[PDB]
Nucleic acid binder design. Structure first.
Length: 796
RNA sequence: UGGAGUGUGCAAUGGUGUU
RNA sequence: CCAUUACACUCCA
């Protein structure tokens, strides 16, 4: 129960499309790579000066240890060589000096056989060695980590003015991926926020938005102090780099330091012969304790400093304006970047005998045919998705709900969301819903104004107690408010009442589209069915009872608190499959693995038996969030749990489980070779594009699928990896099943980027966050919904 | 908080020689 | 050990 099934076959269904994946062919030898561990004298050091130290070391020990040989360096504690150093395997101490004295230690750790990697790529070995991948990646990263500024898995460089005292930098993501019979170099383009190489005296003017310096409070000092504290600066009156720790209250004119107290102005006047044209401005507290103060005039901001401070609205907007590119642009500039590749003249790449193809990889894709969408009414219209999108016009819900009793709680200020607004909104909404097959019969039996979160619970309690058969409460909100979270908390977990929140700006002005989507959400929330997949147009999987599960875990920031990770698992409740039930669990901080999964799956199965009056003969389980290195872990526990949930349900019940992982967190971009295939303004690949060759895993069952229409930028094709399969799916059947499951998402009239169960799981998970706001098992009750909410699709 | 899509945040950066 | 760490575009009936 810990070995993923091999690729059963390749796919044939769909229309052929000629693509180009941003992968580049790598030719690697079968040599043994020698791995050494390093340790520098200052255990805490910037990863750049570590590289400088290492290269200085390699250069200054050419007659004793190194020579023609060039070792690649991880940046932390790992060094790699193509051939064994004349060191043996015992620790060796070497002194290195820099324009300071460093003492490094090198010791052999292991050997990295590329032959094993070759066997893995050929299928001789079922599993791929990780150390090989890591080593190769280090080799590829060495030089660009020296010539450029490494951030995560990307590299950045300068020459873009933003204007927030910061600049925008462009760069490229680079990783190494195993393929069939070969390794691939994955290059993609990216950008990030940096600090502009400025003189501090102008950085002040940018931060406070003074036009220049000629325009001469305490708050002005504080706001600058926040932005500058923690950054590095360089001396211009000699070179030497420091780190800003604070900003003065005493200007250089009236600041003193040791003993005879000399003023910074007078000190720079006597010692540094500087006029100091700005004697009145604050002084940069540098180092610590001991006074080391330097005025703004002599200080410049060092280049290459990344920003972490959350971006201003204008920063984000401007950056998107300066990053927004259609697929052909990204493609062309990636090609442009690999025109400058020249990996065959990079001495470190040459060292390990590696070659890289300077042209993008040609992969062949198949555009799957979209499923037919069935609607209800007496029209019984059948919608056909064109380019991943169909329409909600001249069509009625498959199963429309009659809203007989509903209320309106407006938490927006009465002045901004007036009565005429509410009345008109009601009229239009009732029209749209009437045409949608979800007739809102009468006027709202209740429509009042409220304010603050504290009014939520007493109000809803009044609504539920007073009005018989209350189905829905429409909640008008004045933008971002704690009122939303309170409304969801009370409505979903406390009282069990259906809820639709609406922004006031969407009430002030009517839009048939917005009202339509609103009606979708309302209909679903009230227990209705918007549409179903055409039963005739479905894979044979549905010939037997089958349940579809989705699962997702979200985590709090890594730095703090007992803040728990929350796991959500949803499951289909019909053989369409349209209706889903949700289960939530609070679990240990930062653990990407579902522990209570057995109980949750048990609950979902029990609900399935209560609904269909059948037992699922198959279990199609989509899970999102799990990365590669976690597979063996996840697949070990969760799978068992599922089986546990099957064996503890009844005595000999063991349905065929299909464990599939979904990820968008990758840089695999697919482009059109034929410009006539480019869809839309962004020129992305058509919805339904499937790739299962060339750039995929050499042994195991996985495939790329882009099931959505790309509106802006470059599409992110979802990657699917099959970790288990008792049902023994063929490639085509599973790809098609996934594609059609992408069409069962109720919140819109589109095919989304991932299957509906995973998406729902994400929604429920995100909802739990709102449920938690204002000891483990205490408010683990906070994420549990009401008895009248359990079986509902409350999660929008 | 009508919705989808894609951009940037995921813990990494940093303790340094005179003033 | 200590210091710092969700918004925004583009679209739609």
């Amino acid at each position: 129960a810990f070995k993923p099934p091999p690729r059963p076959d390749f796919g044939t269904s769909g229309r052929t499309i000629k693509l180009q994946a941003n992968f580049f062919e790598m030719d690697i030898p079968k040599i043994d790579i020698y791995h050494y561990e390093l340790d520098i004298k200052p255990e805490k050091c910037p990863r750049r000066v570590n590289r400088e130290i290492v290269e200085h070391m390699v250069q200054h020990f050419k007659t004793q240890i190194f020579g023609d040989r060039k070792p690649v360096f991880d940046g932390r504690k790992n060094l790699y060589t193509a051939m064994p150093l004349p060191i043996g395997r015992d620790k060796v101490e070497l002194e290195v000096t820099l324009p300071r004295i460093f003492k490094v230690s090198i010791k052999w750790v292991s050997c990295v056989s590329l032959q094993a990697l070759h066997d893995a790529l050929s299928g001789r070995l079922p599993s791929v060695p990780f150390e090989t991948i890591q080593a190769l990646d280090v080799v590829m990263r060495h030089l660009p980590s020296m010539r450029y500024t490494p951030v995560g898995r990307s590299f950045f460089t300068a020459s873009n003015p933003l204007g927030g005292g910061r600049e925008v930098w462009f760069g490229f993501h680079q990783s190494v991926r195993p393929s069939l019979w070969k390794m691939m170099l994955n290059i993609d383009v990216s950008a990030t926020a940096f600090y502009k190489a400025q003189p501090v005296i102008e950085f002040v003017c940018e931060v406070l938005d003074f036009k220049s310096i000629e325009e001469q409070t305490d708050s002005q000092r504080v706001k600058f102090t926040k932005e500058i504290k923690g950054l590095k600066v360089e001396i211009t009156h000699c070179k030497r780099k420091y780190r800003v720790c604070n900003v003065t209250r005493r200007p250089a004119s009236h600041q003193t330091f040791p003993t005879v107290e000399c003023t910074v102005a007078q000190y720079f006047k006597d010692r540094h012969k500087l006029v100091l044209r700005y004697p009145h401005l604050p002084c940069l507290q540098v180092g610590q304790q001991k006074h080391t103060y330097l005025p703004l005039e002599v200080c410049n901001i060092v280049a290459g400093q990344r920003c972490i401070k959350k971006l201003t609205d204008n920063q984000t907007s401007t950056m998107i304006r300066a990053t927004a590119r259609s697929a052909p642009d990204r493609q062309e500039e990636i090609s442009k970047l690999m025109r400058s590749a020249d990996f065959n003249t990079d001495p470190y790449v040459r060292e390990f005998g590696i070659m890289v193809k300077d042209e993008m990889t040609d992969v062949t894709g198949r555009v799957l045919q979209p499923p037919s969408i069935l609607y209800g009414g007496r029209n019984k219209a059948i919608a056909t998705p064109v380019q991943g999108v169909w329409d909600m016009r001249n069509k009625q819900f498959h199963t429309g709900i009659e809203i007989k009793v509903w209320a309106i709680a407006c938490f927006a200020p009465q002045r901004q969301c007036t009565e005429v607004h509410l009345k008109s909104f009601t009229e239009q909404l009732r029209k749209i819903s009437r045409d949608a097959g979800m007739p809102i019969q009468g006027q709202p039996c209740f429509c009042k104004y409220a304010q603050g979160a504290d009014s939520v619970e007493p109000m809803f309690r009044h609504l539920k107690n007073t009005y018989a058969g209350l189905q829905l409460v429409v909640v008008i909100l004045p933008g971002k408010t704690p009122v939303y979270a309170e409304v969801k908390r009370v409505g979903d977990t406390v009282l069990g009442m259906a809820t639709q929140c609406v922004q006031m700006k969407n009430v002030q002005r009517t839009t048939p589209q917005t009202l339509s989507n609103l009606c979708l959400k309302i209909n679903v929330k009230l227990g209705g069915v918007n549409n179903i997949l055409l039963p005739q147009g479905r894979p044979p999987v549905f010939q037997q009872p089958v349940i579809f599960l989705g699962a997702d875990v979200t985590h709090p920031p890594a730095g703090d608190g007992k803040k728990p990770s929350i796991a959500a698992v949803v499951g289909s409740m019909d053989a369409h499959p349209n209706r889903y039930c949700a289960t939530v669990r609070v679990q240990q901080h930062r653990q990407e693995i579902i522990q209570d999964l057995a109980a949750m799956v048990r609950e979902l199965l029990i609900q399935f038996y209560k609904s269909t009056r059948f037992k699922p003969t198959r279990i199609i389980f989509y899970r999102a969030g799990v990365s590669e290195g976690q597979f063996q872990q996840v697949l070990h526990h969760e799978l068992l749990a599922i089986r546990e949930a099957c064996i503890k349900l009844e005595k000999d019940y063991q349905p065929g489980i299909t464990f599939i992982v979904v990820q968008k967190r990758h840089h695999t971009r697919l482009f059109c070779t034929d410009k006539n295939e480019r869809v839309g303004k962004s020129g992305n690949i058509p919805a339904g594009t499937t790739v299962d060759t060339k750039i995929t895993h050499p042994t195991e069952f996985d495939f790329y699928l882009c099931s959505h229409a790309g509106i802006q930028g470059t599409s992110r094709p979802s990657h699917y990896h099959v970790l288990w399969d008792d049902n023994r799916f063929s490639s085509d059947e599973l790809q098609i099943l996934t594609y059609q499951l992408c069409h069962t998402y109720v919140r819109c009239t589109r095919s989304v980027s991932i299957p509906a169960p995973a998406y729902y799981a994400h929604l429920v998970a995100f909802r739990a966050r709102y449920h938690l706001v204002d000891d483990h098992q205490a408010l683990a009750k906070a994420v549990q919904v009401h008895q009248d909410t359990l079986r509902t699709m409350y999660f929008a």
